Design an enzyme around this catalytic site. Structure first.
Site, PDB file in Angstrom:
ATOM      1  N   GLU A  57       8.127   8.203  15.109  1.00  0.00           N
ATOM      2  CA  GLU A  57       9.487   7.569  15.098  1.00  0.00           C
ATOM      3  C   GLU A  57      10.480   8.597  14.528  1.00  0.00           C
ATOM      4  O   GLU A  57      11.514   8.208  13.923  1.00  0.00           O
ATOM      5  CB  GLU A  57       9.460   6.255  14.309  1.00  0.00           C
ATOM      6  CG  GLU A  57       8.947   5.087  15.114  1.00  0.00           C
ATOM      7  CD  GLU A  57       7.435   4.891  15.158  1.00  0.00           C
ATOM      8  OE1 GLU A  57       6.655   5.756  14.669  1.00  0.00           O
ATOM      9  OE2 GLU A  57       7.036   3.837  15.677  1.00  0.00           O
ATOM     10  N   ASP A  99      -0.307  14.433  19.435  1.00  0.00           N
ATOM     11  CA  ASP A  99      -0.279  12.997  19.074  1.00  0.00           C
ATOM     12  C   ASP A  99      -0.360  12.140  20.344  1.00  0.00           C
ATOM     13  O   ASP A  99       0.589  12.184  21.136  1.00  0.00           O
ATOM     14  CB  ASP A  99       0.948  12.668  18.214  1.00  0.00           C
ATOM     15  CG  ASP A  99       0.811  11.321  17.521  1.00  0.00           C
ATOM     16  OD1 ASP A  99      -0.014  11.211  16.574  1.00  0.00           O
ATOM     17  OD2 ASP A  99       1.465  10.355  17.989  1.00  0.00           O
ATOM     18  N   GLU A 100      -1.450  11.377  20.498  1.00  0.00           N
ATOM     19  CA  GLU A 100      -1.648  10.380  21.590  1.00  0.00           C
ATOM     20  C   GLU A 100      -0.948  10.905  22.847  1.00  0.00           C
ATOM     21  O   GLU A 100      -0.181  10.208  23.514  1.00  0.00           O
ATOM     22  CB  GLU A 100      -1.185   9.001  21.111  1.00  0.00           C
ATOM     23  CG  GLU A 100       0.096   9.082  20.359  1.00  0.00           C
ATOM     24  CD  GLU A 100       0.664   7.799  19.796  1.00  0.00           C
ATOM     25  OE1 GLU A 100       1.934   7.646  19.847  1.00  0.00           O
ATOM     26  OE2 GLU A 100      -0.114   7.046  19.187  1.00  0.00           O
ATOM     27  N   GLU A 117      -6.634   3.960  17.233  1.00  0.00           N
ATOM     28  CA  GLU A 117      -5.500   3.356  16.493  1.00  0.00           C
ATOM     29  C   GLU A 117      -5.342   1.909  16.990  1.00  0.00           C
ATOM     30  O   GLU A 117      -5.819   1.601  18.135  1.00  0.00           O
ATOM     31  CB  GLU A 117      -4.215   4.189  16.656  1.00  0.00           C
ATOM     32  CG  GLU A 117      -3.618   4.156  18.069  1.00  0.00           C
ATOM     33  CD  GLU A 117      -2.395   5.030  18.312  1.00  0.00           C
ATOM     34  OE1 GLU A 117      -1.598   5.183  17.353  1.00  0.00           O
ATOM     35  OE2 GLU A 117      -2.236   5.562  19.445  1.00  0.00           O
ATOM     36  N   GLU A 156      -4.926   5.539  12.712  1.00  0.00           N
ATOM     37  CA  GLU A 156      -3.688   4.699  12.587  1.00  0.00           C
ATOM     38  C   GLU A 156      -4.056   3.221  12.792  1.00  0.00           C
ATOM     39  O   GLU A 156      -4.064   2.737  13.931  1.00  0.00           O
ATOM     40  CB  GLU A 156      -2.589   5.118  13.576  1.00  0.00           C
ATOM     41  CG  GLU A 156      -1.990   6.514  13.333  1.00  0.00           C
ATOM     42  CD  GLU A 156      -0.905   6.860  14.341  1.00  0.00           C
ATOM     43  OE1 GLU A 156      -0.378   5.882  14.905  1.00  0.00           O
ATOM     44  OE2 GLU A 156      -0.609   8.074  14.579  1.00  0.00           O
ATOM     45  N   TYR A 177      -1.935   3.273   8.400  1.00  0.00           N
ATOM     46  CA  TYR A 177      -0.670   3.913   8.817  1.00  0.00           C
ATOM     47  C   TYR A 177       0.352   2.815   9.063  1.00  0.00           C
ATOM     48  O   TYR A 177       0.090   1.890   9.851  1.00  0.00           O
ATOM     49  CB  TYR A 177      -0.834   4.713  10.103  1.00  0.00           C
ATOM     50  CG  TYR A 177       0.373   5.508  10.559  1.00  0.00           C
ATOM     51  CD1 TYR A 177       1.506   4.888  11.070  1.00  0.00           C
ATOM     52  CD2 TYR A 177       0.351   6.897  10.554  1.00  0.00           C
ATOM     53  CE1 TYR A 177       2.593   5.625  11.505  1.00  0.00           C
ATOM     54  CE2 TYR A 177       1.432   7.642  11.000  1.00  0.00           C
ATOM     55  CZ  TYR A 177       2.565   7.002  11.449  1.00  0.00           C
ATOM     56  OH  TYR A 177       3.609   7.738  11.903  1.00  0.00           O
TER      57      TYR A 177
END
Ligand SMILES: [Cl-]
Length: 780
Positions: A102, A177-178, A305, A346, A378
């Protein structure tokens, strides 16, 4: 010395550890507050801190690196690593280059995008808007990759120095990241039409060339072509569906290439385990990830996650069980094949307005239940975004974190604490089996159709798998709530031999199913398997040509009108079966012709069972879904289908609202409902408790020992979770009832924090009924 693993746990200096972590993004928490936040984290029993390192933060302008907080206290990566090591925490470091979070551009410097816009991924009719979050980048553009290597060259010398193997606290490095093509892979035609992708002999033409013969592309796209360069990328749904699936698979391949480049650079610096989180942000597409890393020899630890509620109150009730069983069954399939420890890096602990402890307990309790026994929460420590670096939240990075920006402790710490204690005290839980009798077999191309929500123009079946398969009324939720724990297999990757490990396989079918997949399912049945298939049989292959092998093998026809997508025009249909009165189903129901009838709508047979070779298949002309009622016909029908095919649960419960997931010598016992459940379990030739009933007053999770040894004593069974073992002391916890039953082979000296109100000796076993305020200690 070394960080290694045995496929269940990471091993540090040859000690097995359970990774039990929280995320503290040092760069969004005041530097004054770090030591305080890390000490509270330790106090909750966390042994690991996760953090991103954000390229755009440590390199705010081209060439101006700051890792010591010359320029801003929170740019002091070195200091954060030093403090984590000082307080005896392990570190997981995720240096991107993309970190999502974010965070402005997901860590990508604005100066880079402004300098080299040519790196930006494009739509089919031109550039994407420039003011969108995480400006999508052509991963394989040389200029992008050149700049990433520059970032890796600066942060990896520091990571290298703080590796566990170099004397530091870092036990793992996560790639990017993902990686999802900057969350653009959800749309068939949003990206990427950049020149490097689409120019003649570009990445698209290269990929086609490597994957397919022209003779294959001709059958598959149903055109003539004399060269691969004649085939333009698809830009809309007028194009052959196979070509659009290929375009989807091609984006995943560029992602795989991106990851391989990152892995190779990282491997120059790092000799601890290297991980990745949720490739593509997909689940069935993990077949491509598995195949790619096997083929390219990349030793990458797959991690996952759990995110369920976004910018609303946390909503985690019975409804989620389908999706969670599916996601963790998928994950469990892949980490078992790759033989790497299962880890959720996460686990949602923020970005829901309020996270209620019984709902958080259900999610957090389900991870180890279904086989994820290494857990990072997370976001653990609430922060604040420095000005210029805001994206998704403006100023705030404290949306109901377990520790607030003010250092307060919020309610979801309670489940976080006791689950850690239980995993630490019962490392055998990590090695427990998941012995599923039943599998759900997923067909990956269906994921893509569901993702896009586009129903192909003459498809007789709906692509709304969120409704009928995954969601709050999904088939998978019904199986979960019917007390059918299940594995997930990929139908394209699985061999028939692997399929034959399962007494029963469920398949959800649309119009098309690959020839090899249709053949394997027939052979599975022929060789003694028990297939359940619904709500139709496929009649097309992967090129959308007539192929009805599974239907000719089973000798049944499934005829009916096409499913409707207009919610007003979706019919309701009442289905009878032996012992089943008017089970409600939604959307059109098909006549099942042939076989032995097992389900009818008045005159008409809509479900049948056939025997082929050694095996059986149940063919349902309807979408079986989870509806809850007093009459409870949906769960009763699942029971009938398992009895029809002779499938035997390892366990029984007297209250069928009590969910049991057997894990060898542990039972994960789950109340997913917002009402009390009370009853007894039959497992491993015993029924317990015997003196009292097992009461779960509300939503929660227990992990009950069955014939578990603690030093010289054995706990034959407990209605309470063991949270700690010392020499002669076992601590039990059950916040769901004030009465616990414990059966013990051994000398019981007494009970602290509980009163024994009943006692029986039968040979070697002491059985006690203990009244307690939620926690008691047995002395031995
Ligand atoms: Cl600031």
């Amino acid at each position: 010395m070394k960080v290694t693993h045995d496929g269940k746990l990471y091993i540090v200096e040859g000690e097995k550890i359970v990774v039990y972590g929280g995320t503290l993004q040092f760069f969004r928490v005041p530097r004054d507050a770090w030591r305080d936040r890390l000490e509270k984290m330790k106090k909750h029993g966390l042994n690991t801190v996760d953090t991103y390192v954000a390229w755009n933060w440590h390199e705010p302008e081209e060439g101006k690196f700051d890792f010591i907080g010359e320029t801003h206290p929170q740019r002091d990566l070195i200091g954060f690593l030093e403090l984590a090591q000082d307080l005896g925490l392990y570190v997981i470091i995720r240096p991107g280059p993309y970190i999502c979070g974010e965070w402005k551009n997901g860590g990508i410097p604005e100066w880079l995008i402004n300098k080299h816009p040519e790196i930006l991924a494009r739509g089919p009719n031109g550039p994407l808007p420039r003011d969108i979050y995480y400006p999508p980048i052509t991963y394989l553009h040389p200029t992008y990759l050149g700049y990433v290597m520059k970032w890796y060259e600066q942060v990896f010398p520091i990571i290298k120095d703080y590796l566990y193997t170099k004397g530091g606290p870092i036990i793992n490095v996560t790639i990017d990241d993902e990686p999802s093509y900057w969350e653009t892979i959800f749309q068939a035609f949003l990206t990427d039409y950049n020149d490097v992708v689409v120019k003649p002999n570009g990445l698209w033409h290269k990929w086609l060339r490597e994957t397919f013969s022209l003779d294959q592309l001709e059958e598959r796209y149903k055109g003539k072509f004399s060269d691969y360069t004649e085939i333009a990328p698809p830009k809309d749904f007028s194009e052959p569906l196979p070509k659009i699936i290929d375009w989807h698979h091609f984006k995943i391949w560029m992602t795989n290439e991106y990851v391989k480049t990152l892995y190779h650079k990282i491997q120059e610096y790092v000799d601890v385990p290297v991980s990745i989180l949720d490739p593509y942000l997909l689940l069935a597409a993990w077949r491509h990830f598995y195949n790619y890393i096997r083929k390219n020899n990349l030793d990458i630890h797959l991690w996952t996650e759990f995110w369920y509620s976004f910018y609303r109150s946390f909503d985690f009730k019975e409804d989620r069980l389908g999706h969670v069983y599916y996601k963790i069954g998928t994950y469990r399939y892949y980490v078992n094949k790759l033989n790497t420890p299962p880890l959720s890096i996460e686990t949602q602990s923020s970005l829901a307005n309020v996270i209620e402890k019984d709902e958080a307990e259900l999610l957090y309790g389900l991870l180890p239940s279904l086989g994820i026994h290494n857990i990072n929460y997370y976001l653990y420590v609430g922060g604040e975004n420095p000005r210029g670096y805001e994206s998704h939240n403006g100023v705030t990075w404290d949306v109901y974190s377990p520790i607030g920006l003010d250092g307060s402790e919020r309610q979801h710490v309670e489940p976080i604490k006791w689950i850690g204690e239980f995993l630490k005290a019962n490392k055998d839980f990590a090695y427990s089996p998941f012995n599923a009798k039943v599998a759900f077999a997923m067909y990956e191309p269906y994921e893509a159709l569901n993702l896009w929500g586009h129903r192909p123009e003459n498809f007789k079946e709906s692509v709304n798998l969120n409704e009928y398969l995954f969601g709050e009324r999904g088939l998978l939720t019904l199986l979960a709530m019917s007390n059918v724990p299940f594995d997930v297999i990929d139908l394209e990757n699985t061999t028939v031999e692997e399929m034959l490990r399962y007494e029963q396989i469920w398949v959800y079918s649309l119009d098309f199913m690959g020839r090899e997949v249709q053949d394997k399912l027939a052979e599975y049945v022929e060789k003694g398997g028990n297939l359940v298939i619904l709500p139709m049989l496929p009649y097309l292959d992967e090129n959308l040509n007539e192929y009805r092998k599974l239907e000719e093998f089973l000798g049944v026809k499934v005829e009916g009108e096409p499913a409707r997508d207009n919610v007003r025009l979706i019919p309701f249909v009442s289905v009878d079966a032996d012992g089943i009165d008017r089970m409600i189903v939604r959307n059109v129901v098909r006549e099942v012709k042939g076989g032995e009838p097992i389900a009818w709508v008045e005159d008409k047979v809509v479900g049948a069972i056939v025997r082929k070779g050694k095996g059986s298949a149940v063919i349902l002309g309807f979408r079986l879904q989870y509806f809850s009622s007093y009459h409870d016909m949906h769960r009763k029908f699942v029971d009938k289908i398992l009895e029809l095919q002779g499938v035997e649960r390892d366990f029984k419960v007297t209250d069928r609202d009590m969910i049991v997931i057997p894990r060898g010598n542990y039972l994960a016992v789950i109340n997913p409902r917002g009402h009390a459940v009370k009853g007894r379990i039959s497992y491993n030739g015993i029924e317990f408790p015997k003196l009292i009933e097992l009461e779960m007053k509300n939503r929660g999770v227990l992990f009950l020992p069955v014939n578990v040894k603690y030093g010289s004593v054995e706990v034959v069974y407990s209605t309470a979770t063991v949270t700690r073992y010392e020499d002669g002391k076992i601590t039990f916890r059950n916040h769901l009832s004030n009465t616990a039953e414990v059966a013990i082979k051994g000398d019981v000296e007494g009970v602290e924090n509980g009163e024994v109100v009943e006692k029986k000796q039968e040979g070697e076993v002491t059985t006690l009924v203990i009244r307690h305020p939620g926690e008691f200690v047995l002395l031995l």
